[PDB]
Amino acid sequence: KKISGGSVVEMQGDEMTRIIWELIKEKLIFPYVELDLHSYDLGIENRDATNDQVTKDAAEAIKKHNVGVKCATITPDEKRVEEFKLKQMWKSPNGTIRNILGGTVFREAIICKNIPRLVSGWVKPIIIGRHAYGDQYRATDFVVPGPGKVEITYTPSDGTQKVTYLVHNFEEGGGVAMGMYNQDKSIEDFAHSSFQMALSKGWPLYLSTKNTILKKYDGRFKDIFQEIYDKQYKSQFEAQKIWYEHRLIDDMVAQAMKSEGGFIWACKNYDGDVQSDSVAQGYGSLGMMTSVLVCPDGKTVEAEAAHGTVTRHYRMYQKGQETSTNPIASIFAWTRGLAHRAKLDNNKELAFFANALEEVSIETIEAGFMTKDLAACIKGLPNVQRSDYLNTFEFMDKLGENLKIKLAQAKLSLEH
């Protein structure tokens, strides 16, 4: 007897993280949970073979089944095109999925008592709410080949007017130009999700923009957040002795760095990409971070392993060398996805399991059993010896052992 998991959309990935993904399912999920798994191969070869259609199909399946769990993938560059003999330099699958679903990607460090922080003052968590739609991630950028005029136009759908703004007149040589946008409804959804997250955690909320420079573009984010706060959330914030404030991005980063944590940080798409990584590194390890896309319907989520594909480790693995790759981000993509699945299905057994696997992952590391990266955090990379860490397989074995113990003990406890 396994737990009835329900419907989950899974997206397979690339390189080392693809290997780890299969170990996780084989050792940590499948022995305990029975799932109706809707699998999509987002490996670079399958994306190339389906002309990136598999990415769009996976995003539509998430809309249908409400929970997706995604493995980290390769976003190809010139070198990758040559390596895999790709038809095109395919766009980021994350950008494609996020553009289809919309929402806010909430990112937070996975804290272990024995991992030292780079920022000693951060005693409370920092949650990054990254706007997942538009801006640089759905932009139109091109090379300007020589002298000439770049203009940007708006034509309302009634056809009664046309506005033409001059971007730049290139007089000597060329350069680059780009157009980008955002949608009012997407900004409103981002605001609602940020206010709701601040209220569920009982922490103040800060929105960062550069509205002093982008008066109209960033000014709209600032105006939409303020308007929604004043009309729908101000009394709720006052009741919990918390607040909402707008800050300039350069002021916000410096304020975050010298703070003690304990706040929600609403970031525009590009800033949330950079800041979520910086904050994760500030808590100790870039890889020790959750990443959950919360869609506007309040029912759909996509949990992911946000970090790289770890090419260096993958090359070693191919050459038959020993590797010690951290699987926690991939584990927490599963647990966060299963926890949301459990919440939708009112499934106490799956809710218990998802939480238990997160506890086991943290308790394992805190018991002194970890991969090379985490061992380097504690000791410093030059002082790390083979005895200080477990290889990928040894670490997964330790986790499997600890998970079995935790679930067996919980079964025996509820037997009265």
Ligand X SMILES: O=c1[nH]c2c(Br)c(Br)c(Br)c(Br)c2[nH]1
Comparison of 157 and 200: residue with beta carbon closer to a second copy? 157
**Cβ neighbour number for residue 65 with a 10 Å cutoff:** 17
Q: Which of Mg ion, ligand X, a second copy, none binds 298 (CB below 5-8 Å, type-dependent)?
A: none
Q: Which of a second copy, ligand X, Mg ion, none binds 299 (CB below 5-8 Å, type-dependent)?
A: none
Comparison of 225 and 265: residue with beta carbon closer to ligand X? 265
Q: Which of ligand X, Mg ion, a second copy, none binds 140 (CB below 5-8 Å, type-dependent)?
A: a second copy
Comparison of 111 and 199: residue with beta carbon closer to ligand X? 111
Question: Collapsing DSSP states into helix, strand and coil, what is residue 160?
Answer: coil
Binding of Mg ion by 75 (CB under 5 A): no
Select from 282, 284, 287, 327 the one that contacts ligand X (CB under 6 A).
282
**Ranges of H-type helices in 240-327:** 249-258, 269-282, 311-318
> From the CB of 335, what's the least distance to ligand X, in Å?
25
For tokens 């949330």, what's the residue?
A: 272
Q: Which of Mg ion, ligand X, a second copy, none binds 344 (CB below 5-8 Å, type-dependent)?
A: none
Binding of Mg ion by 304 (CB under 5 A): no
Question: CB of 90 within 8 A of CB of 52?
Answer: yes
Sheet holding 289-294, edge to edge: 33-41, 3-12, 67-70, 301-304, 289-294, 104-109, 126-131, 263-267, 205-209, 244-248
Select from 273, 302, 358, 373 the one that contacts Mg ion (CB under 5 A).
273
Question: CB of 119 within 8 A of CB of 257?
Answer: yes
Binding of ligand X by 257 (CB under 6 A): yes
Comparison of 29 and 253: residue with beta carbon closer to Mg ion? 253
Spatial distance between the Cα atoms of 128 and 107, rounded to a whole number of angstroms: 5
Select from 83, 151, 223, 250 the one that contacts Mg ion (CB under 5 A).
250
Spatial distance between the Cα atoms of 283 and 144, rounded to a whole number of angstroms: 42
Spatial distance between the Cα atoms of 263 and 103, rounded to a whole number of angstroms: 19
The phi-psi region of residue 173 (left if phi > 0; otherwise alpha if psi is between -120 and 50; otherwise beta) is left
Site size for ligand X (CB under 6 A): 9
Spatial distance between the Cα atoms of 141 and 149, rounded to a whole number of angstroms: 15
> From the CB of 262, what's the least distance to ligand X, in Å?
14
For tokens 């420079």, what's the residue?
A: 213
Binding of ligand X by 278 (CB under 6 A): yes
Draw the binding track, 286-325, toward ligand X (x: CB under 6 A; -: no contact).
----------------------------------------
Q: Which residues are annotated as a binding site?
A: 73-75, 80, 92-98, 107, 130, 210, 250, 258, 273, 277, 308-313, 326
Q: What is the 3-state secondary structure (H, E, C) of 215-231?
A: CCHHHHHHHHHHHHHHH
Binding of Mg ion by 251 (CB under 5 A): no
Comparison of 277 and 394: residue with beta carbon closer to Mg ion? 277
Comparison of 152 and 274: residue with beta carbon closer to ligand X? 274
Binding of ligand X by 279 (CB under 6 A): yes
Encoding tokens for residue 118? 């780079």
> From the CB of 234, what's the least distance to ligand X, in Å?
28
Query: Which window, 91-99, 219-227, 251-259, 353-361, contacts ligand X (CB under 6 A)?
Result: 251-259
Q: Which residues are annotated as a binding site for Mn(2+)?
A: 250, 273, 277
Spatial distance between the Cα atoms of 296 and 164, rounded to a whole number of angstroms: 33
**Cβ neighbour number for residue 374 with a 10 Å cutoff:** 25
Spatial distance between the Cα atoms of 110 and 326, rounded to a whole number of angstroms: 12
Encoding tokens for residue 334? 């599963």
Binding of Mg ion by 358 (CB under 5 A): no
The phi-psi region of residue 148 (left if phi > 0; otherwise alpha if psi is between -120 and 50; otherwise beta) is left
Query: Which window, 6-14, 138-146, 229-237, 252-260, contacts ligand X (CB under 6 A)?
Result: 252-260
Chain residues in the site for Mg ion (CB under 5 A)? 250, 273, 277
